[PDB]
Structure 1
């Protein structure tokens, strides 16, 4: 299959530097959080990953709910709260952890759990990290 969309982002200076997409849409400074000896003035790779994952997955949730043909939902009926952490692995190394809190409005609990299970096969983030990060997921309805 051919690539549906591609984008480029330039990062200079590591976790204390800057990032800027080539189209200028995304441009912001980075800072080490206080937990890693920084100020926390600005975002960080974990925050950026958390945001992109939560947004991909929520969109895939909408996409799966609508392909199942049962529920009437609008986009804002889906909320994903991602928790992204960085832990120590091996000797001195670092690994990521991900937990997803998925809240669906106007859907039964069993259907929401089945929907969320389905979207893990859809969102490219989940497919990207399967087996390396053991993603945990809790499904809420409201």
Structure 2
């Protein structure tokens, strides 16, 4: 059963607007300068990069807890997502995704094992498996 559901209205594509129905997310969008736009507002790739970095970091927190070896706080987890858009060779586009994951205060080996476990848990990682090959680098700070 559905634990949480949300609606967002988008009008006018990549030059237009988004507004969540509850008003909490309300943003103008622009084409980036690389595509000839002004780049003075966000875009689908940035919104996706943000959703996935946040969800993945959250799931890393949950996996590190319950493994029950380390006593970590929220901000000991940073995820830097790189999301790109490319033509797919079949008249459409694909995303590319890279994640740099930085965990504070745990060993390199444990951090890598935690990130591997998290990739099986995170809803977004499971949403793209078999279509996008996500690449990941793990850092320990």
Structure 1 length as normaliser, TM-score? 0.98
Q: Deviations over 1:26-83 (max 9, x none)?
A: 0000000011111001000000000000000000000000010000100000000000
Distance of 1:25 and 1:116 partners within structure 2: 31
Q: Deviations over 1:12-36 (max 9, x none)?
A: 0000000000000000000000111
**How do 1:28-43 residues align onto structure 2 when only pairs under 5 Å count?**
28-43=27-42
Q: Structure 1: where are the runs of 5+ without partners?
A: none
Could you say what secondary structure the match of 1:121 adopts? helix
Moved segments of 4+, more than 6 Å: none
Displacement, 1:92? 3.7
Question: Using the alignment, how far apart are the partners of 2:7 and 2:132 within structure 1?
Answer: 25
Shift of residue 91 of structure 1?
3.8
* Deviates further, 84-93 or 125-134: 84-93
Aligned residues: 141
Query: What TM-score do the two structures reach when normalised by structure 2?
Result: 0.98
Distance 1:24 1:93 in 2: 32
Partners of 1:124 and 1:18 in 2: CA distance = 26
Q: Structure 2 unaligned runs (5+)?
A: none
Residue number in structure 2 paired with 1:57: 56
Instruction: State the 1:116 CA deviation.
Output: 0.2
